[PDB]
Design a protein around this nucleic acid. Structure first.
Ligand SMILES: [Zn+2]
Lengths: 97, 82, 211, 101, 24, 128, 125
RNA sequence: GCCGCUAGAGGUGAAAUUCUUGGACCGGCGCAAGACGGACCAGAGCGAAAGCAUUUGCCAAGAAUGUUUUCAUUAAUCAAGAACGAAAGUCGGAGGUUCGAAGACGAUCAGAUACCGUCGUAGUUCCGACCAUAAACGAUGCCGACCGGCGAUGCGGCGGCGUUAUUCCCAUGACCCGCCGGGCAGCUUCCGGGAAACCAAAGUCUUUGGGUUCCGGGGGGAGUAUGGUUGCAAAGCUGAAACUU
């Protein structure tokens, strides 16, 4: 778990600093699956861009579908401008590769 | 119990017991033949063998000695004789 | 008043952390043979990693030794690492065996390290039994994998990447993934890093070590 | 008069358990005749945690706990009321006592 | 009397007796 | 403390086993009942007996009392269920397949009113 | 936020409240439980550690030391390893009397079963 | 040993003996010394019993299981005899950090030459040579047979839905439900026993014999006296009467 949802970025940016990418992704899944972080904050979009970024280069297709289902449960509030933005940025990074 | 027949035991309770504790003791090993898949020697192995049984075509090992049954090398074919 | 002759120096962290200014130290001023900048060359600080970065991870404490002072700035270099006492005593419970190993691995910059590890055996989620113990060959070859990873993933690196590994503990996750065919482990930490011998101090390596 | 069948020990099937020393009187008891007790509390008390919390520079810092492993001899438990004397027929109750309601 | 100290006192008595008997 | 002792709540119950056709719910009737039906010495015992038979008749007509006899059931055979369709008349009975092997080897199961359901995966029935 | 480090050696006989700088060498103030009471029976009181905490707070306020880390410590070694009664009154009083409080850690020294203890085999009776 | 602060430290029910302006206690970085192996550590393991715990080696040794391997009664218990046997103890040498008999002081008490504090010799520690006693305890000799159940636990073997490795359906391990053997123990039972406590043996015993070794005969005297032998010594083993109740 985390004590504060911004800390997911501070952990995942340290795992990419050495260059391991599998603990970097699965921390960022395990912050979203926690039960205290489904109420919308501003930091939940830029970790979800990063978790969709990290699913691309490891080419894990099963894992990105689950978190984009989970974030779709989270933003049932009126900011689907986030849910538009997280989806096409995944669909930008997939075409570039 | 206490009317129980000792002269006609059922085979569920005759494969249950230890091999010395039956009416007639009978061993729990059996004789196999191992077929190696790239040669034509049918080769006769024990179930519980203790040496590495060497075949004579392509000189491979068929079985590995372990504390129980010998684990045959994976991808050969066996059947029990008799 | 013996506190009138004390100037307040500043202490600068190495470059691997986000936050550099970690606090303020004191020295009596130069009145004789006692020079200030030799009077502090041996200060060692126990600084936590939720102070060197603004993360929540509080249990992993760093030792940082002042080697040279430039201006009023104390320049530090890395001296060791510890877990705190309540984290390391929070993890020893009954009904699990504990696998601990130590290696002395020499880095590529002349620095010698000694790395201590810890690991416990994880009980399963569909398990019934109370006790989860390993046999002795399982503890021996999990300890063999532990010493092998902790000399191989520190052996051909410089010091800055070693402290970069030690902040998230990539070594603990690597040990826990590699050791799961023998017995599934539970939280695996590099507990304590000692710095046994250091090479000659020259200012260019520390002045590039700050950035 | 045999009083206890296990003789108040955990020594079944070995010759010697190495002794530990009591924390309260330093009386050398064996490892398993001693009454082990593991006392976990917070480091700050329940009273002073209400005004520690206004002084912390860190937002949302959960304070650590104190992990004390206590061994006790058999004399100083009945002096210290950790363990008290029970009936002849409820000595066969070796379920630990309830801490929950 | 605790029987170890009865034993010890007859031990001291026999040690003094064998002291007094081998002088001659 | 106003607890009634053994005589004023045993004697009141042996007064209630017989003579139930005379007793009622009002205290002043039963107080006047108690001298035809008994020989009681002086009235404070008789008022205490009357108070307990009024409290017991306050209790007794909405269910069974432990101490009272099946003279209560003589009242429930004097004053007082199935459904229309029985709860054993259900039309699909789920059967896990070991029962179906038992019924096949009892010479039933040619007749089908049952429906066999899928077997469980996992054997975790114990407690840790 | 000039940090110092408070060192609380809480004995059963005494109470050492020691405020130092971040490494620990340059001592800013040291007050013991023996400085504020006239009696050996009450050196380890809550009251002696309360008064010692107030004096070390007044000393470290005037030097710039605004905030404090805690190193809480028992007698340790082969002796008892609970910090005694004078830890809590010092640590409550520092947070009451105008200081700020950092991370609290238990620094009681624990052996790998070190050498024999002061009582006999048969106890302290 | 070097710092850098300061008037008390220690210890107790309360204190005093002890240490401290030649700088103690506490804090910091260091060096060395010797002991010790916490938490993990359980009615769990191994050993003939005494006992045995940091890592990695090397050296031999062993129970258990598996066995359609071989020998063919080789076996069970043990007069004489021998091997090991905690701690204390004795002698020769090396080592000595802490504890600590004797001892010197303090204080509790009428008195304490006891518990309670300060310090300490011999010893505790290691390498050789002795001594062979313990509530060395399951206060229960050893081998074999037979006689109810139950659920786990340690090891080895066999068979069964599944679930997990990840990095190749992936290898082999970790769990799940059973079975067999051996082992440490458990809860229950009007098997049965026992004087009872209790015991699945301390059962199958007046319905009395599977084999075999040491040993007890009311309480003291006394494990004393003497005699013998073992030991540098302390002592060990064998070891009675008279008398008394
Ligand atoms: Zn005690």
């Amino acid at each position: 778990y985390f004590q504060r949802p911004e800390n997911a970025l501070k952990r995942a940016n340290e795992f990419l600093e050495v260059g391991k990418k599998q603990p970097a992704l699965d921390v960022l899944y395990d912050v979203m699956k926690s039960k205290k972080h489904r109420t919308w904050q501003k930091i939940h979009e830029p970790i979800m861009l990063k978790y969709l970024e990290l699913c691309v280069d490891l080419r894990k297709s099963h894992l990105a579908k689950e978190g984009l289902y989970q974030y779709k449960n989270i933003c049932q509030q009126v900011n689907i401008k986030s849910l538009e933005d997280v989806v096409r940025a995944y669909l930008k990074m997939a075409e570039e590769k | 119990p206490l009317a129980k027949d000792l002269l006609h035991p059922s085979p569920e309770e005759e494969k249950r017991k230890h091999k010395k504790k039956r009416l007639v003791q009978s061993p729990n090993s059996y004789f196999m033949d191992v077929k190696c898949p790239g040669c034509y020697k049918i080769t006769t192995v024990f179930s519980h063998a203790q040496t590495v049984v060497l075949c004579v075509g392509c000189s491979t090992v068929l079985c590995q000695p372990t504390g129980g049954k010998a684990r045959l090398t994976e991808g050969c074919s066996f059947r029990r004789k008799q | 008043d013996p506190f009138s002759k004390k100037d307040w120096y500043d202490v600068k962290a190495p470059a691997m952390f986000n936050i550099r200014n970690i606090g303020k130290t004191l020295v009596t001023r130069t009145q004789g043979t006692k020079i200030a900048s030799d009077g502090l060359k041996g200060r060692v600080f126990e600084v936590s990693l939720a102070d060197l970065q603004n993360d929540e991870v509080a249990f992993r404490k760093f030792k940082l030794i002042t080697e040279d002072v430039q201006g009023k700035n104390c320049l530090t270099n890395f001296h060791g690492m510890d877990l705190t006492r309540d984290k390391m005593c929070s993890m020893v419970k009954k009904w699990q065996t504990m696998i601990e190993a130590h290696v002395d691995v020499k880095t590529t910059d002349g620095y010698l390290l000694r790395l201590f590890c810890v690991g416990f055996t994880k009980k399963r989620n569909n398990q019934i039994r109370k006790t989860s113990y390993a046999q002795h060959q399982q503890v021996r070859q999990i300890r063999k994998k532990m010493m092998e990873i902790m000399t191989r993933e520190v052996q051909t690196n410089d010091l800055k990447e070693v402290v970069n590994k030690l902040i998230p503990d990539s070594i603990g996750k690597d040990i826990e993934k590699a050791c799961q065919s023998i017995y599934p482990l539970h939280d695996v930490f590099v507990r304590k890093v000692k710095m046994l011998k250091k090479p000659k101090f020259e200012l260019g390596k520390l002045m590039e070590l700050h950035g | 008069t045999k009083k206890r069948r296990n003789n108040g020990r955990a020594k079944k099937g070995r010759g010697h358990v190495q002794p530990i020393r009591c924390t309260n009187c330093a009386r050398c008891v064996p490892k398993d005749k001693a009454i082990k007790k593991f006392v976990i509390r917070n480091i700050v008390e329940a009273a002073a945690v209400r005004d520690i919390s206004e002084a912390s520079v860190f937002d949302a810092y959960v304070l650590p706990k104190l992990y004390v492993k206590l061994h006790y001899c058999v004399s100083c438990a009945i002096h210290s009321k950790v363990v008290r004397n029970r009936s002849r027929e409820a000595r066969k109750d070796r379920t630990p006592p309830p801490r929950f309601r | 009397m605790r029987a170890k100290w009865r034993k010890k006192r007859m031990r001291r008595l026999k040690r003094k007796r064998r002291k007094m008997r081998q002088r001659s | 403390g106003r607890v009634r002792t053994k005589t004023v709540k045993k004697a009141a119950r042996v007064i209630i086993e017989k003579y139930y056709t005379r007793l009622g719910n009002d205290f002043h009737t039963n107080k006047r009942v108690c001298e035809e039906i008994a020989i009681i010495p002086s009235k404070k015992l008789r008022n205490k007996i009357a108070g307990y038979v009024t409290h017991l008749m306050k209790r007794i007509q909405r269910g069974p009392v432990r101490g009272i006899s099946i003279k209560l059931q003589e009242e429930e055979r004097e004053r007082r269920y199935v459904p229309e369709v029985s709860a054993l008349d259900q039309e699909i009975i789920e059967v896990d397949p070991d029962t179906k092997e038992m019924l096949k080897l009892l010479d039933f199961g040619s007749l089908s009113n049952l429906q066999v359901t899928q077997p469980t995966v996992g054997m975790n029935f114990k407690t840790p | 936020n000039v940090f110092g480090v408070c060192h609380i050696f809480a004995s059963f006989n005494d109470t050492f409240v020691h405020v130092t700088d971040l490494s620990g060498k340059e001592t800013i103030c040291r007050v013991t439980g023996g400085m504020k009471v006239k009696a050996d029976r009450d050196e380890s009181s809550p009251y002696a550690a309360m008064l010692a905490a107030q004096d070390v707070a007044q000393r470290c306020k005037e030097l710039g030391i605004t905030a404090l880390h805690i190193k809480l410590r028992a007698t340790g070694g082969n002796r008892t390893k609970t910090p005694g009664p004078g830890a809590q009154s010092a640590l409550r009083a520092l947070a009451r009397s105008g200081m700020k409080i950092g991370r609290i850690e238990d620094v009681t020294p624990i052996p790998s079963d070190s050498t024999r203890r002061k009582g006999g085999r048969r106890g302290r009776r």
